[PDB]
Amino acid sequence: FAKTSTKEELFQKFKTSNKGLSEEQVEISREQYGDNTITRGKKSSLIKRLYQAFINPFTIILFVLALVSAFTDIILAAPGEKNPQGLIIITTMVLISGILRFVQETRSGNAAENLLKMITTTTNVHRLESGSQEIPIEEVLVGDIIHLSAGDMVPADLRIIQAKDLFISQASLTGESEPVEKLDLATAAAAASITESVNLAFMGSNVISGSAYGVVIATGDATIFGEMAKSVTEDSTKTTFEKGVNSVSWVLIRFMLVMVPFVLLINGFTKGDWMEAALFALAVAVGLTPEMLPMIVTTCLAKGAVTMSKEKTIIKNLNSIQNLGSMNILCTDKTGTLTQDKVVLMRHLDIHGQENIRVLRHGFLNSYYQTGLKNLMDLAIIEGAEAKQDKNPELGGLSSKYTKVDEIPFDFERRRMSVVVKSNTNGATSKTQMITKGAAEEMLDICTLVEDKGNVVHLTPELRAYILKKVDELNEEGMRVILVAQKTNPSPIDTFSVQDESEMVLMGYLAFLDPPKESTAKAIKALNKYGVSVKILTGDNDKVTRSVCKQVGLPVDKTILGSDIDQLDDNELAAVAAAASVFAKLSPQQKARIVTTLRNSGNSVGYMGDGINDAAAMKSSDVGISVDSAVDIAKESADVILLEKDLMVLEKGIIEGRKTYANMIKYIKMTASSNFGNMFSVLIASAFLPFIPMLSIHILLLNLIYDFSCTAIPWDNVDEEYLVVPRKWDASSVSKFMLWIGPTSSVFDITTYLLMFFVICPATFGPFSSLVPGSVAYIGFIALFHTGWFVESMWTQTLVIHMIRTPKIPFLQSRASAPLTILTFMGIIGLTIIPFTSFGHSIGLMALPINFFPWLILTVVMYMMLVTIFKKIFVSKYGELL
Amino acid sequence: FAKTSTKEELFQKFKTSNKGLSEEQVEISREQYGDNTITRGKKSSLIKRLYQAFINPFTIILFVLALVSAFTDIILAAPGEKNPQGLIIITTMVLISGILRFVQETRSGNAAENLLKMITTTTNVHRLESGSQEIPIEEVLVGDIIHLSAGDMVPADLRIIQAKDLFISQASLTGESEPVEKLDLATAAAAASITESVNLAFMGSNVISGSAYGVVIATGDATIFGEMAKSVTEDSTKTTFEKGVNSVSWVLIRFMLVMVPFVLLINGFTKGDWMEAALFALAVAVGLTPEMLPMIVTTCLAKGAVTMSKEKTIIKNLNSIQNLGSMNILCTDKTGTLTQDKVVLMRHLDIHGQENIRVLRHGFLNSYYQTGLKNLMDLAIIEGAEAKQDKNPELGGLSSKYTKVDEIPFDFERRRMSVVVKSNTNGATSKTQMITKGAAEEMLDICTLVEDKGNVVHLTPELRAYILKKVDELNEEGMRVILVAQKTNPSPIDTFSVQDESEMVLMGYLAFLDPPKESTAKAIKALNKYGVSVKILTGDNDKVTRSVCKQVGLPVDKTILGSDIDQLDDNELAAVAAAASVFAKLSPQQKARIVTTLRNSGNSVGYMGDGINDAAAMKSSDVGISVDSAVDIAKESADVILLEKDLMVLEKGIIEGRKTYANMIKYIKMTASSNFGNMFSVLIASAFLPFIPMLSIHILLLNLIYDFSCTAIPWDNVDEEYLVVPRKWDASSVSKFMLWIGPTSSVFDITTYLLMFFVICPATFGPFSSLVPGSVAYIGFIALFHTGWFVESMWTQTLVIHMIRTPKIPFLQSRASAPLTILTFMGIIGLTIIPFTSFGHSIGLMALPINFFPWLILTVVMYMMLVTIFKKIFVSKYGELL
Numbered sequence A, B: 001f002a003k004t005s006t007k008e009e010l011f012q013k014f015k016t017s018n019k020g021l022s023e024e025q026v027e028i029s030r031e032q033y034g035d036n037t038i039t040r041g042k043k044s045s046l047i048k049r050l051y052q053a054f055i056n057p058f059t060i061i062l063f064v065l066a067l068v069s070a071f072t073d074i075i076l077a078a079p080g081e082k083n084p085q086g087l088i089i090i091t092t093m094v095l096i097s098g099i100l101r102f103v104q105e106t107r108s109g110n111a112a113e114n115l116l117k118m119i120t121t122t123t124n125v126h127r128l129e130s131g132s133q134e135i136p137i138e139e140v141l142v143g144d145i146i147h148l149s150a151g152d153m154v155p156a157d158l159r160i161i162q163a164k165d166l167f168i169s170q171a172s173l174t175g176e177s178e179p180v181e182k183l184d185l186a187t188a189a190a191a192a193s194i195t196e197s198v199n200l201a202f203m204g205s206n207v208i209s210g211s212a213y214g215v216v217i218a219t220g221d222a223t224i225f226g227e228m229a230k231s232v233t234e235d236s237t238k239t240t241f242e243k244g245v246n247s248v249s250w251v252l253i254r255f256m257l258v259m260v261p262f263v264l265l266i267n268g269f270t271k272g273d274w275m276e277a278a279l280f281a282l283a284v285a286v287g288l289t290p291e292m293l294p295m296i297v298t299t300c301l302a303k304g305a306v307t308m309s310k311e312k313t314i315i316k317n318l319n320s321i322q323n324l325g326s327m328n329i330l331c332t333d334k335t336g337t338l339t340q341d342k343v344v345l346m347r348h349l350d351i352h353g354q355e356n357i358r359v360l361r362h363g364f365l366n367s368y369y370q371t372g373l374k375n376l377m378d379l380a381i382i383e384g385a386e387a388k389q390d391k392n393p394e395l396g397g398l399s400s401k402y403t404k405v406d407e408i409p410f411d412f413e414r415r416r417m418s419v420v421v422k423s424n425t426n427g428a429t430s431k432t433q434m435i436t437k438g439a440a441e442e443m444l445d446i447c448t449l450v451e452d453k454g455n456v457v458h459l460t461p462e463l464r465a466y467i468l469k470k471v472d473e474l475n476e477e478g479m480r481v482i483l484v485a486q487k488t489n490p491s492p493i494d495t496f497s498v499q500d501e502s503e504m505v506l507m508g509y510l511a512f513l514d515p516p517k518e519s520t521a522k523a524i525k526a527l528n529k530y531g532v533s534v535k536i537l538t539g540d541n542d543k544v545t546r547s548v549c550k551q552v553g554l555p556v557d558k559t560i561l562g563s564d565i566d567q568l569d570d571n572e573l574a575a576v577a578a579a580a581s582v583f584a585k586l587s588p589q590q591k592a593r594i595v596t597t598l599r600n601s602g603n604s605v606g607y608m609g610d611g612i613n614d615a616a617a618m619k620s621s622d623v624g625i626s627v628d629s630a631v632d633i634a635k636e637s638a639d640v641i642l643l644e645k646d647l648m649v650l651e652k653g654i655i656e657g658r659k660t661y662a663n664m665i666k667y668i669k670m671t672a673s674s675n676f677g678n679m680f681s682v683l684i685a686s687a688f689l690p691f692i693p694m695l696s697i698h699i700l701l702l703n704l705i706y707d708f709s710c711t712a713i714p715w716d717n718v719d720e721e722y723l724v725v726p727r728k729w730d731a732s733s734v735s736k737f738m739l740w741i742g743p744t745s746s747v748f749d750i751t752t753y754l755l756m757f758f759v760i761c762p763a764t765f766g767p768f769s770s771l772v773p774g775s776v777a778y779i780g781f782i783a784l785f786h787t788g789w790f791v792e793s794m795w796t797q798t799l800v801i802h803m804i805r806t807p808k809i810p811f812l813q814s815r816a817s818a819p820l821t822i823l824t825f826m827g828i829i830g831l832t833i834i835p836f837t838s839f840g841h842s843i844g845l846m847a848l849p850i851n852f853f854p855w856l857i858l859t860v861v862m863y864m865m866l867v868t869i870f871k872k873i874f875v876s877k878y879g880e881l882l
């Protein structure tokens, strides 16, 4: 906590050695404080940290199901080599799921190029070697004498000891392209925010002209710019989506490790050899886990990103749009993001508070014949002249009458620009008037004549009070005022002096605000409509960010200043930030801290900005956006970088992202319930069946071929009501839903059991308990049961989706199954309904007797209606289906 | 034991003086044998013997309601007075069951007046005390010298010592009214059956002609008539119906003994309020018992008996028609029942086996002119000659052409009767014709000429050989044979005398037999079609019964006699009875012995009879059927009485007795299943519901208003494939239809347990676990949950009978139900108005919302499909969904 509090000790005296730094003292300084360097790095072993997640309940199944092959190996040959139709499928599934979990994050890693910039060298500095020279950056240290000249860049913060009308553009840290004066004088003892610390310089700021001497007092981590450079590394926190998917996988694992040992114990103690029990438990381990869930998740995310890639928005990280959908609080930079860093006239009125055409027309003249020096405020005046709709050409023709005799341009030493022009009225060369505008200070000091009530009077103390009150109403919004005044004079044979420019008749006041973008208000309203709070994080002065956001409609209440959050501890910081609004005067570390605390409270926080100072906040957020005017480094740190300028597209994301999550939270439940029910019946009927109902490979086929319809699940129609609230990744609701709707299938999977064990299978192959257990029709009976339960389970688990996807009254009310999904479903049922081919060496073909299908349709219909009842109960119990 | 083998000690002597018998002799007889009395008795405790059955669960239920009333009233005062609402109805139901069980049993008990009838005494006895007198059979002594005249009553079993062509009518024991000769000579010591007991007589027989002196061998219960009187009592054996009903009641008792102590323990261990657990167990016990089962059973039996009473067949016992339906073997008497006890001509034949009309004509005149004495034999000849297709009136003309000279009537010495007639053709006094008929043996000895092939030859030994061969050929066929001889006699000076009966000329022989009733063969065929075997237990000789067994059509092999069947043991008798179709020479002991043994072998046996000898078997059988020609004792001791003597109606009765059974079992399987289901769910809910789902009174109302339509089930449409095999009462068969298609209603009862837990929470009653245990909530919420699975449990168990009623036939191949049992069924479902009535305040039972019915319809439609699937699984595993 080494701060720069040595006031009046570091002024007028270097407080250290003047360039004669002792070697021992140099070593002491570099030990206790260190040098000025910025460290960065990359990684290429992302595979190690991206495999482990939901891959493990696949490599565990692989290890168990290959140890099964090893167990039947070394003893048997055909049973020990007929397994690989397992191991191979499970291994390629492991590889696919791992590669997909890799690509879901690879876009962020390979699209982040925040390293090309900085590491600046070749600094024009005064050194003891040869005076003013180009020196490498590693030769400037704490206590070194550094000079800022015309065109050189400051490499480290400085305690400036000499200044001469020095102006610096601090858009790198404050986001404001307008230059601000920087002086060598000691500031206030209590000081202010770091950006307003005139006595100290900032790394990364650009100087165009002027020279200044200073001494480096801070380097390393104490540099604010060093801070944002060091903060932007591969500290990519796990967003909401990753944690949600991990929690869902852990719910599945918590179910698997409770169900598997139970069925293992039952089938080991009850009837069979422990090899049969191991196979039986492997069946329940395979069935519970939806094998192609990562593929469906990736395809949903890809659909979202592709859709958002047509609204003209680069999506950098593929996992950004779901986070955009689940966005709860949007923290937004002010300078250049919602405003447009463009000075435009908004208040230009007489001393009574109404627009004066004459004064603005005079300003238009002084700015349109302004050939000496062009300045952004002059462009503001001229553009407002045309926005005013009062025609220019008369004034354009007034060049022939109100002829420009001469001009003293906007010289910065006196902050006065004075155009001396003659009023050729009606053809005669009349008197000459000069109009000077400049900063309010000198104008107020020199002005004693005022145009009031239509005449010219002296500047009385009451008129001074009135003018000061107008200045105060203009300043309280954080807007600077430039005074304009005309003076009449006879034809000047001699030149004009500064002392003659006094007692000049002032017209009024000017206000060049940075107006918010025309779509900002509509974007804020749309964001508030979809349950997304909006907060403002800007380094600008509090007054201007009350003025703005008192114009966009956002409730501005007790704007928190930077010092308050700096002195505030983390818990009450989180308490304040959530229940508050626009913040002011923040450093990049402050923005990152605020976003992080908002994250820790349980809110998925997105961020938007354009400046380099916003990079830390962009990277610390769940989803970092960037408007078109964003700087290149901010673009690289972004995730959903925009292109046009319109913020309306934000809602087109927030809508679309939500309709992705629903389509992903549908399947995740809609396939975890069924897969539970299918695996429930292989548990509570795992003791009465003298053989496993459906083998491991058959269940792998069922969970694979059915999961290719969920490839078309992302195109299903989410109705209109899920898309109004940012939904949280509630995995516990999954563990309830699949315990409520899942078992309703299991009973019918028992009805299919008894049926197919008593009337269908014994019909063709004779009654059971009368067949030789070795082989004869025992193989045929077992295969017929296998294929029949295959067909029935597939039908009944992929046709109930039309009943589960939507809340009450499907079809008629909510026209379900948008044609892509329903087409794929009926195109994949027609695939699984064919175990009649040469692909019946899957250890069951047993072409089903026609007698079975009437009993299959009767099961499907009655299961669909029972699921309707249980869906009603579930909706009426907790809050809804998902 | 003491058979008629005590010869040279008691036979050919008296062992006492002839009629010179003293007092010491009668005291010796009393000491050696005892009183000569017949034991008789009755009872009037039918109430105690007939209450116990399925009424004991009702009395236990009454006791438990009484305990609940006392417990809720010995502590509290307001709750302890609503228990009468259940106790009174249950205690009226106990009495209803008692009355309806006493009625369906005591009809046969008070329909038996066997002991009231019979009891004959006052026989003519000679004694030294007062000469000839009338001494009661209660006063006859062993060894009494008894004088026998025509028309007297035999006092005891009687070894005759003096006889002169003594003839005894033995229809009382053999069923044949035709007299049998009884001889006093020294007979065989080993003797034979009663029909061949030529040396001794039996009780109850009337002497037709002749006088005799005999000695009493035994008295009291040792006599055959005394034996049958002792065996025939009010010992109506438990028919198969009572055993089946007790088995069903015991199935229910085992089910409630397994369930009730489970619910009580679950609710006494969880939710530790033991009173509320006893209420749960009481509810389970109340809902498990079908409360109006005895009334439905009684109404089914009454419908069967009433509808059979219309077919000229008075039914004496309510259970007779049901036992007829469940009858498996029908044992019928031969004489009087299968045959018609009427001698009829069947073979008028010459001496060499050619149909000679001349012998028929000679018999015609020989009978038509026998005016001095008429007999059934002569009437038989006359009737058969009318029916022999030969025109009798032409023969009648010969009556005017053959006038009578004289006649020698049937004498008591030579046993021949003769008519001497003229041959006055056109009035011309030609030679006389003498025609003598009688027993073959005598006039076969006295014959000297025979007429063969139109000529006359001497009585050579060869022709006599063929005459006897054909005579005992007819005797082998059972035909009673008579011989007829003509003599061409020159005009005698005087009338025809005994010496005029020499030098006969035989013409031929005649065959008299009692042909079976013309409907006997058709009845036997119809019974054999319905899986009812027929046996011909009779006391007649083996020859005639073997002949009849061929005409009607039956297995003529293994004509098991009476001596051997008396010789062999019961265990072997069971084996040989099922392996034999015709039984001959049977004493009334043996008929009852055979019927009882066949009953013990697992066959429900009915008996048909017409005589006194039948009564023992009639009472020892499941159902006794009496023909029109039966003696009043046979009519009184039977259970079914015919009125048109047409056996063809019999099969019709069986059909009724089967369908009356089918509906009944269809009822028992309908209710006992549903009840179980509707009180299986409670078991499960016992661990989860915070309160009782239905109180005892609600379940009583459900089981009473649903059993008031099973009063209309007996009129439903029974199939036509169920009535082609005698169905046996099976308890296990109703315990496996109750575990199989019963728990398929629990699935749709745990659903309406949960739907009704989250569809009436919004019924202004708020969600549960939020209501204080006060009122207008916890009182209304519970009431609405009752009016839930009350209305729903009445709809789902009264409308699923149409699906279970029949074996596999969905709704159209059987025309499910008759208009009576569908109209009543829906008219009792329309009693879903109890909740919306002033009598909807039998505590609970509050007004249902309209919202419930769309779910009730869905549940009652869902449940029928599951019932169809389990019906198909049940039919295809056991064999009959009955």
Ligand SMILES: [Mg+2]
Pocket (backbone or CB within 6 Å): A674, A677, A678, A745, A749, A792, A793, A794, A796, A797
């Ligand atoms: Mg399934």
Ligand SMILES: [Mg+2]
Pocket (backbone or CB within 6 Å): B674, B677, B678, B745, B749, B793, B796, B797
């Ligand atoms: Mg029910």
